[PDB]
Structure formats: structure tokens, C-alpha cells
Design an enzyme around this catalytic site. Structure first.
Site, mmCIF file in Angstrom:
data_model
loop_
_atom_site.group_PDB
_atom_site.id
_atom_site.type_symbol
_atom_site.label_atom_id
_atom_site.label_comp_id
_atom_site.label_asym_id
_atom_site.label_seq_id
_atom_site.Cartn_x
_atom_site.Cartn_y
_atom_site.Cartn_z
ATOM 1 N N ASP A 282 46.343 40.544 -30.968
ATOM 2 C CA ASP A 282 47.123 41.754 -30.774
ATOM 3 C C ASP A 282 46.221 42.977 -30.671
ATOM 4 O OD1 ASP A 282 49.029 43.767 -30.733
ATOM 5 O OD2 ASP A 282 49.600 43.529 -32.858
ATOM 6 N N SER B 138 46.795 56.058 -17.138
ATOM 7 C CA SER B 138 47.031 55.534 -15.800
ATOM 8 C C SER B 138 47.196 56.688 -14.825
ATOM 9 C CB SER B 138 48.273 54.640 -15.786
ATOM 10 O OG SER B 138 48.647 54.267 -14.466
#
Length: 330
Positions: A35, A199
Site C-alpha cells: 500500500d 497530473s
């Protein structure tokens, strides 16, 4: 040194991925959920409340010659889906794919929430976010990656998740045969303890690319892709019959639909998520309403590039002094 381990989807929806991990001496092999959005290595164990164990493999420290109680140390964690676990701490030898750390903090669960109990395929979690998020008290502990780092050929690990198929986690090297074209690297902020990046925009299907900055985290421990409401609305508007359902808890769509792809920007590069990756199937057995793999982050407080996004790419987690993230097509 390096390590290389295969990671396997736990079910037919790629809800999560498990990777075998060797703990203790002689080895006890547990299947853990790697994770990159948390920083605790915790396991089902001989100490876990019996009623809260249902089919998991447990770590038994009393059977390990290298296990030592970390006296006085406790841990307690809550995840973004509302699940939680807590317990005490041992140090022991931990190996992933041939790569060994001695003195690794192995957090032994005394209690786990129902979501963990119900998932018999996950024996614990192995956190790969930054160690500043580790919950051990009073002495914070380091992740497996942080402990391994100085021994690695290169201070990196890579995630190569499969779509309905096995993939790979590598430590200490970049497998240049595992991706196509070039890797595009982008800056990381560690300010919140995550692999947090920005992004450069998105496109829906064959639509034009929208340049817009989207701050989010690369999180292998989250199933879906969580983005701003504007972005998610623009995506599902292209699917006939798609709608946000408060009863179901997100966007649903007719199972008869063909989903468009979703493109996200990494610098001037583009990663394309095929439409099929965004299909998470019937909301309930036999239903003709299907659950979407792109959902709104509104009210999460953060955008999350979970497995839906990450499995479309070869992803480099660069833990050099100045950390970065790299994305390649594959």
C-alpha cells in the site's frame, strides 16, 4: 541488493493485490496488500481476536527465533474507507522477493475491523508511503522500503500491476523490459507523507486533452480512481444512462454500455486507461447496473490515483533524496 515479487489480484474485479512476504525464522509466508498510501506493515497474528479472524494466515511470533517484542510500542490506524486495525509490535526479519530486512517493525494486530475480517485473502498490509505516516507509538518506525533503501542498487521500487492478471513489485532496480517507450518523471511532495504529485490534465475517450493541474496521490492500496467532481462528471457524461447514485455511493452505469477510455497527463506524456479497466461490474449479483471505476474525490479531501490508474502504467517510486514518480506505458 534487489528484490522481485509477483503481485496477484485477490478477486475477479482487481479489488486489491496480494504479494507473498516472508516473516521470521523459519519463514512464515503471509500474503500482504502493498500500500503506497500508508506506512505500517501490519499482520494478522496469533494475538488477533479470534472472532475477527476468518481464513487469514497468521504470523505467530512465538514460533520465530528472530522475533522480539518491541517493548511498550503500540499502533492504531484508520484508512480512507473507514476500516481500521491496532495492536502491538515485534521486530523480525522480513523478506520480499529475495530482499531481506532485519529488525523490521512487524505490527501485530490485536483488533481488526470487519472489512479486514471479511477479506480472507489479505493477511495484512505492507505500507510503502513515507515513514512520517507510520503510527507506531511512542517510537515511530520505518517502512520496509526505508529500511531496505541503503542496501538497494538504486533507491527505488516499481509497481507493475496487472489488469485481471498478475504483476510485479520490484525493489532496487528498474526493469527496462517491463514498459514501452520512455519513463516520464514528475515531482513529488512529501509534505503530507504521500507519493503526492500533480497530473497535467485529462481526456475522455477520443476527446481533446484538457490541460489542468490535478494534485493527487499514487496509492496502490486504493482500488479506484478518485478525481475532482468536474472531471468525473465530464467522463460519465459520455456514457449513456450513467448517473451518480447516493443509494449506491457513486457513479453507476448500464452494464450494457461500452465505456470510453480515460487519459491522464504526466508532464507532456499521457497514460491511457482503457474503458474496460473502469468497469467494476454489477452493483449486486445479477444487477444490470454496474459500478464505475472513476469516482468523485469530493469529500475525500484528496485526489487518489488508485489501482484503476496505476495498473495502466509502469510506475517508478523514486526514493532518492529528492523523491520523484515515474510513469511509462506498457
Amino acid at each position: 541488493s534487489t528484490g522481485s515479487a509477483t503481485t496477484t489480484p485477490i478477486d475477479s474485479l482487481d479489488d486489491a493485490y496480494i504479494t507473498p512476504v516472508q516473516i521470521g525464522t523459519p519463514a512464515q509466508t503471509l500474503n500482504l496488500d502493498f500500500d503506497t498510501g500508508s506506512s505500517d506493515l501490519w499482520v494478522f497474528s496469533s494475538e488477533t481476536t479470534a472472532s475477527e479472524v476468518d481464513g487469514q494466515t497468521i504470523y505467530t511470533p512465538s514460533k520465530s527465533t528472530t522475533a522480539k517484542l518491541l517493548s511498550g510500542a503500540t499502533w492504531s490506524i484508520s484508512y480512507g474507507d473507514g476500516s481500521s486495525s491496532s495492536g502491538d509490535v515485534y521486530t523480525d526479519t522480513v523478506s520480499v522477493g529475495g530482499l531481506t530486512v532485519t529488525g523490521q517493525a512487524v505490527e501485530s494486530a490485536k483488533k481488526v475491523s470487519s472489512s479486514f475480517t471479511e477479506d480472507s485473502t489479505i493477511d495484512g498490509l505492507l505500507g510503502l508511503a513515507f515513514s512520517t505516516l507510520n503510527t507506531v507509538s511512542p517510537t515511530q518506525q520505518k517502512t520496509f522500503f526505508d529500511n531496505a533503501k541503503a542496501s538497494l542498487d538504486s533507491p527505488v521500487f516499481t509497481a507493475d500491476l496487472g489488469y485481471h492478471a498478475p504483476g510485479t513489485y520490484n525493489f532496487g532496480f528498474i526493469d527496462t523490459t517491463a514498459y514501452t517507450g520512455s519513463i516520464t518523471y514528475t515531482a513529488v511532495s512529501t509534505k503530507q507523507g504521500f507519493w503526492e504529485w500533480t497530473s497535467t490534465g485529462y481526456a475522455v475517450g477520443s476527446g481533446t486533452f484538457k490541460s489542468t493541474s490535478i494534485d493527487g496521490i499514487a496509492d496502490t492500496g486504493t482500488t479506484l480512481l478518485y478525481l475532482p467532481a468536474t472531471v468525473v462528471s465530464a467522463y460519465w457524461a459520455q456514457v449513456s444512462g450513467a448517473k451518480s447514485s447516493s443509494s449506491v455511493g457513486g457513479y453507476v452505469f448500464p452494464c450494457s454500455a461500452t465505456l470510453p477510455s480515460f487519459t491522464f497527463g504526466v508532464g507532456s506524456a499521457r497514460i491511457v486507461i482503457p474503458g474496460d479497466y473502469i468497469d467494476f461490474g454489477p452493483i449486486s449479483t445479477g444487477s444490470s447496473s454496474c459500478f464505475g471505476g472513476i469516482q468523485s474525490s469530493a469529500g475525500i479531501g484528496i485526489n487518489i490515483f488508485g489501482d484503476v490508474a496505476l495498473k495502466a502504467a509502469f510506475v517508478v517510486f523514486n526514493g532518492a533524496t529528492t523523491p520523484t514518480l515515474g510513469f511509462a506505458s506498457k
